[PDB]
Design a protein around this ligand. Sequence first.
Ligand SMILES: Nc1ncnc2c1ncn2[C@@H]1O[C@H](COP(=O)(O)OP(=O)(O)OP(=O)(O)O)[C@@H](O)[C@H]1O
Ligand SMILES: Nc1ncnc2c1ncn2[C@@H]1O[C@H](COP(=O)(O)OP(=O)(O)OP(=O)(O)O)[C@@H](O)[C@H]1O
Lengths: 158, 110, 206, 969
Amino acid sequence: IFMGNVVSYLLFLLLFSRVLLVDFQPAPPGSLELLLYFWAFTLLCEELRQGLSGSLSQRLRLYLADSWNQCDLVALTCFLLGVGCRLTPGLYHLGRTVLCIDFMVFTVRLLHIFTVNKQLGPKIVIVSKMMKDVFFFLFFLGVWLVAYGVATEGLLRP
Amino acid sequence: MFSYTFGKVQGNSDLYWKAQRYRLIREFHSRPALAPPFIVISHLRLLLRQFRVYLSKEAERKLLTWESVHKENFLLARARDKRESDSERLKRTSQKVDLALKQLGHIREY
Amino acid sequence: NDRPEFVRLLISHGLSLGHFLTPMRLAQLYSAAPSNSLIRNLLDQASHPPDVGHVLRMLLGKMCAPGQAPWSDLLLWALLLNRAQMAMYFWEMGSNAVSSALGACLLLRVMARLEPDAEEAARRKDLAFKFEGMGVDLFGECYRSSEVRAARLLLRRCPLWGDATCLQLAMQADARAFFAQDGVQSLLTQKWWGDMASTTPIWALV
Amino acid sequence: QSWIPKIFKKKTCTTFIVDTVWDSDAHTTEKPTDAYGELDFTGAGRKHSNFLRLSDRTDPAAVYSLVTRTWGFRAPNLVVSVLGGSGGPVLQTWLQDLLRRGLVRAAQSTGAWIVTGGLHTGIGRHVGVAVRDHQMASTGGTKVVAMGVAPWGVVRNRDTLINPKGSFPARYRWRGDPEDGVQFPLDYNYSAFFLVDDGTHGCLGGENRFRLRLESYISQQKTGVGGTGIDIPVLLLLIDGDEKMLTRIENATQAQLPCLLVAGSGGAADCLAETLEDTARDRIRRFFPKGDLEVLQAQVERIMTRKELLTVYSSEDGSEEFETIVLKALVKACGYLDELRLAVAWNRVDIAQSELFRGDIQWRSFHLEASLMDALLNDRPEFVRLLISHGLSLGHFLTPMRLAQLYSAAPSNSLIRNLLDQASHPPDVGHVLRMLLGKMCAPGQAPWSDLLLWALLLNRAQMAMYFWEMGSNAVSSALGACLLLRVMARLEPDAEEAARRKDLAFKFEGMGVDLFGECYRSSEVRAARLLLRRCPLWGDATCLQLAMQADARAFFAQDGVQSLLTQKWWGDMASTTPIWALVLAFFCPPLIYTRLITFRCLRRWFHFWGAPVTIFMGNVVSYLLFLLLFSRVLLVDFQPAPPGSLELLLYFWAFTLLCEELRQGLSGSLSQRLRLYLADSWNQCDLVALTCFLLGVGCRLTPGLYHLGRTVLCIDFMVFTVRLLHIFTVNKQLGPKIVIVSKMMKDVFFFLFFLGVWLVAYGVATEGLLRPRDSDFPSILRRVFYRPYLQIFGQIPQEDMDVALMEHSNCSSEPGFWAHPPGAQAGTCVSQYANWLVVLLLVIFLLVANILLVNLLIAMFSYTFGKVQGNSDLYWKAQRYRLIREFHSRPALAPPFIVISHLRLLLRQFRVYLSKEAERKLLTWESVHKENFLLARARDKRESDSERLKRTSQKVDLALKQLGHIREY
Ligand SMILES: Nc1ncnc2c1ncn2[C@@H]1O[C@H](COP(=O)(O)OP(=O)(O)OP(=O)(O)O)[C@@H](O)[C@H]1O
Ligand SMILES: Nc1ncnc2c1ncn2[C@@H]1O[C@H](COP(=O)(O)OP(=O)(O)OP(=O)(O)O)[C@@H](O)[C@H]1O
C-alpha cells in the first residue's frame, strides 16, 4: 500500500506539473485540469477520512495541532484558493502564482511520506533539529547584511 | 554547529523514529488498498457501510504460565547477581565479623 | 503503614491472599491515602466504598482502564498511592507481567501530569521508568526464549487493561525504550511486510 | 492430559459388608479415573501442583513416566522418603533444625526428591514447614521437589478434584474447615500429589504398598543422560514412629532400601538405633507400652537380620553433615556405586575432592574412568578437570565404544544429532567434519583433539576450553575451533544457539590471539614458523588459511601477523627497503646488484622480480600505460577507417587483460566458482568494463555504428580508469580510506533524495512563474533540473530569470507584460507578473541547497567517518592477507606480455616445511608458552579483589564455625 501510494503521489505531481506548465491557460479548464481537480478532491477526501478516524471538537483540535497536517491543510487550501482565483475571469495570474507555490507545498510532502521509510526516517527527523543553528546563521547574516549593504550604498551614492 | 548538533541528537532521533515506526505502520495498515484517484471507489464503500491475536482459554493460560516462568527466572537471576556483587559480599563479611566479635566476647567473659 | 519488607515476609510465610483481601479491607487501604495526595483528590471528585473504577476510567480513558489472590487490585492500589516498592512486589507476584508493566508505566506517566508537586511528579516518572525497564527486560527474556510466543504475548489483548495490546499501551505511555528493542522492531517489520516474508527484496517487490 | 483416564484407574466399592472381611481387591471395581490434573490452592498465590488419583494396584512405571515426562519433573539424583512423625504440632527444635538445615538443604543441593505424606498433618506438615522455612531464607537457588503419597479417602474437600474431562485448574479448598482427626487437607508445600485410592473412606495405611513399590522402582532407574549412570539412590529417613513404622522399615529393608534412623526421636527410631548399637524386651516394653512382645520381638529380629541396611543419625552429627551420612548409608548398602560416582550424579565437586584427597582408600583406574565417563556424559567440566588432574590415563580411557557413547549423548533436537543422522544414510564424525569444513580443513595416546572436536560439535564451552588447554597445536586448534563454531552457527535453527556458538568462537579467537601474542613476543622467527606451518589436524591448513576461512579479523589485526604479512609482501627483499629504492631498481635492473636493495645473478634476478611488491609495481605501471594507450587511441587514432596498429595493440592488450581475468576466475565446481565470481562487486565492474569494450569494438567495426562505438568506448574508459582504486586497495596508505569511502553512500543518497525533492519543487515553481514561450520538453526539463542544479555550483543566470535585468518587449500575444531573456536556452520571452517571487525563490533555493543541505552532508560525513574508522581499519587488515596472496599467485610478467606466461600455463595443463624433530621442538615451545599464559591468567584471576573478598568470606565462615565449636563447650 505504501509503494502504491508513493507511485500515485509521484504521478499526481507529474500531472500537476504537466497542467501547470502546459495545460494552464485563461481558457476554461481542459480534461487534464479537471482530472487534477478530481485527484485533489480524492486527496482531500482521504485527509478528511484520516482526520475523522483519528468528540468532534477534540479530534479537530488534535488534527490542527499536528505540524504536518497543518502543512497538508495549507496545501489543499492553497489549491482551492488558486483554482477559485483562476476560474474567476479577473484573477488568472494570481491563481497561477498561488498554484505554483502550492506545487512546492505538495512536493515537500514526499519527506513526510518517506518518514516511515527505514533509511530516510532518522535523518529526516534529525533535519528538524538543525533549525536553531539555521536561525542563528540567519540572524547573524541579516545583521551583517544590513550593516555592509547600507554602508556600501551610502558610500557609492547611486 | 551542524556537526555538533548532529552528534548530539543522533541517538535521541533514532529512538524517536523507532518509537513512531509502530504508529506509521498502523496508519498504513488502516488505509484503503487502493491509491488515489481510485480511492474514491473504496471511499464510496466506506460511505455506504455507515496487529492482534485471539487465543483460546487453554492457549492463553499456557502463554501466561510461560511468561510467568520467564519472569521468575529473570527475577532469580537478578537476585543472584545482586547477592554475588562485591558490595553485598563485603556487607555479609562485616556482619559475620560482628557475629565473630560477639562470640569472642562471650568466650572472653569466662 | 507502607512496610514492603513486612508484606514480602508475611506473604512468603504461608498466607491466603484471596481470603485476606475483603472489600472492607480494600476500602480501608484506599482510605489510607494522605488528604493532600492526588489520589485522595481524585477519589473525592469521583464520589460526587471508594470509586477506584471511576478514577481509572477518568485517568486512562476507556479500553485501557482496569476468592483468588488479587495481585492486580493490590498493584493498582500501590500505583495510585505511588508506593514504589510495594508496587514492584505486587508486579513481581502478578501474572500479566509485560502488559501490567506497560500499564503501570502509562498510569504513572498520566498521573505525573496531574501532580501539583514537581517532586511527586518526578517520583511518579522515576517509577514509570523503572516499570518500563522491567517490561523491556522481561520481553527481552521472553523473545530470546521464543519469538512466536513473544509476538503472541505482544499482540494479545489484556482484559486487565481494557483489552489493549502491549503495543497500544506502549504507544499511549510513550515508552520509547520498549519500542526500541530488537524483538519489537522485528515484529513491526514482520507486520509491515504483511503476509509476505520480511526478507523479501525490494526489487522483487517492485 | 486426555489419555490419563485410559491408563490410570480408580477403585469404587461394590460389595457391602457391615462394620465377612472386606477385601480391598475383591470387593472393588476399577474404572477410568476422574480426578487428575493440576491444583490451585484457592486464595494462595502459589504455583499449581500436579495431582493424580490412582488405583492402589497401579504399576510404578506408569506414574513415574507421567511425573518425569508429562508433568515435566527432572529425574531425581536421590530420593529421601521421610517416615514416622510423633503426634503433636510441635516438634523438637533440634529435629526441626535437622529437617530444615539438613534434609531440605541437602535435597536442594543434590537435586533430590523429598517423598512423604502430602497431607497437612504429622511428618508431612513438619517437612512442609521445613521446606517453607528453607525457601523463606533462601538464595536464588532451584526449588525443592516434594512428593506426597497420600490415601484417597482421608483427603479433605477432595470432591472439588473430581472432573472426568480433566480438572486442570482444579480449585482446592485447603483451609477454613474445623480440624478433624479423620480427614486432612493437602499441604501446598508439595510439588506433586499421588492420591492412592484403595476404595476405602477415612482409613489410613492403604497407600503404603504403592509408596514402597514406587520407591523400589525408582531405586532401579539410572541417573544422567540415558541409562548410563548409577542406580538412583533411595534412602528412608525415620523419625519417631510406631509398630506400623516398624512394619514399614521391615518391608523397606526386605526391598533392599537403606534406612537412616534419627537417634533421640522416640519410639521405633530410638528402639532400632539402640538395638543396632547394642549388637532386649525391656526396650520394647518401654518404647511400646500395650504392645504384644512376641510379634514385636520377632519383627525386630527380622529387622536386625539385614543390619547393613540400617544407619544411625547420631545426636552428635550436625545438619551440615547430612549428605556425608547419606553417602555412608548408600555405599555400605552397596557392599554398584562408589563415592565418586555418587558425587558426579549429584553436582557436588567438594565431595569428589574430599574423596580423592583421602589417603586411607586408593582409587583404582576403573573407579576414575567410570566417574570421568559420568562427568563427560553429564556435562560436568569441573569434575573432568579434577579427575584428570588426579592421575588417570586418557589414552586408555577413551575407547571407540566410549567415544560412540559420548557422541550418542547429544540431544535429539541438537544440530549435531541432525548432522549425524544425515551422515548415517559408530558415529560418522569424520563425514560431518568433511561436510562442515569442506576438505583440507576438516580433521593409545591421550586423545585431546578427539575430545576437543566432540565438545565443539556438541557446543560445550567449558569442556571445549579445557580440552584446548590440554592439547598441543594450540594456535591452529583455536583458529579451527573458531572456524567450526562459526560454520555451525549458520546451520543453527535457534538464534540463541547460534549466538552461543558465535560467543564461543569469539572466545577461541581471543585465546588464539593471546597465545600468538605471547609466542611472538618470545620469538618472531618461531612464531612465523608456527603461523606458516601446516597442521595435519586441520587438513594441512596453515593458521592464515584458518583465520581467513573463519573471518577472524582480530587475529589478522595483531602486530605480529601484520609484520609477517609485510615480510611476505616484500618477498626475498628486506621489509625496510625504501619505496624510492624499489622504483630505482625497477627502472634500472642492474641496480638490484648494488647496495640499494638488501636481499635476505639469476637467483637474485628471480628474487627481485618475483616479490609480490615488484609484481604489484609492474602491474601498476602496465595498467597506467594501458590507460595511456587507451586515451591515445580514443582521442587521436579512432577514425571510421579500419583500425590501425595502435588500435590493434589496444585490442591485444584488452584480450590479455580478459585472459588474466579468466585465469583469476578459474583459479579462485564450475557453477559455484562462476557464482562466486559474479557475486563480487569489483569483478562485476571489471566484467562490465570488458563487456563494454567488446560492445564498443563490435559497434565500431560495423560500418553503421561508429559513433555509438565511440560513445561506448568513452564511457568504458571511465570504467577502466576507476579500477585504479581497486588496484591500490592493497596499498597500505590508500586502503583503509578507500574502504571508508564506500560507507558514505547512505549519506550521499540522503543528500540526493533531499536535493531531488527540492529541485523538483523549486524548478517547477520557477518554470511555472516565468512561463517561457520556448516550452519544448527538453527545454522544460533543462530549466527545471539542470539550471537549478548548476546554481548550486555558482552558476546563477540572473539575466535569464530576473526581469529587471531584461529588456521589456511585446513578444507575446497573450495579455500581460513580457520580457526577453538573452539566454540561448531560456524561453526567449517570459512573464513579469510576479518576478519578485522568482527572485525570492532563488534566494530561498540558495539558502536551502548551497548552505543547509551541503553543510548537513558535511556533518553526516564527519559523523560516519568517526563512526566507521576502526571497523574499516580492521576490515582492511583482515583483507590484506588475501590481497598479498592474490598478488603472490599471479605471473611475474605484466600485460600485454602476460600472454607469454599464459601460454606456459596452457601448455602445462606462504608455507614452511619442518622435519619431525623441528616440528616437535616448535610444538613443545608453543606448549610452554601456552602453559605460561594460562598460569599468568590464573594468577591474575586469583589476585583480583573479587576473589580475595570471596576467600575472605569463606575463611570468616570457617572462623565462625570454629568459634561456634568453642562456644558449645
Ligand atoms: N493445607 C495447608 N497446607 C499448607 N499450609 C497450610 C495449610 N493450611 C494452612 N496452612 C498454613 O498454616 C499457617 C497457619 O494456618 P493454620 O492451618 O494454623 O490455621 P488457618 O486455618 O489458616 O486459620 P484459623 O485458625 O483462623 O482457622 C498459615 O501459614 C497457612 O498458610
Ligand atoms: N607408575 C605410576 N606412576 C604414577 N602414578 C601411577 C602409576 N601407576 C598408576 N598410577 C596412578 O595410580 C592411581 C591408581 O592406579 P593404580 O596403580 O592403583 O591401578 P591401575 O593399574 O591404574 O588400575 P587397575 O586396578 O584397574 O589395574 C591412578 O591415579 C594412576 O594414574
